[PDB]
Amino acid sequence: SISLITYLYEVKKDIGPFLVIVPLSTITNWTLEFEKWAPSLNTIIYKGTP
DNA sequence: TGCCTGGAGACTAGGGAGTAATCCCCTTGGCGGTTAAAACGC
Helix, strand or coil: CHHHHHHHHHHHCCCCCCCCCCCCCCHHHHHHHHHHHCCCCCCCCCCCCC
């Protein structure tokens, strides 16, 4: 998913908006993977207290 | 104590109830996640 999104965004210069649905207990793994492999793409993740 | 009418016995049948066949929808049990509600204390 990261490779496809990054390739499309680098080719088209259309970084977003993009929406991803991630089930719980995996949000932090996706966050760490995005921070590590693709620092150029930022993400907004909702969690914690209302 | 005497009298009689409501109760009972025999015969007929048809319709409501019992039984089989069919199926899907409402229920039951469980788990995830969130958070407003429940518990404890001064």
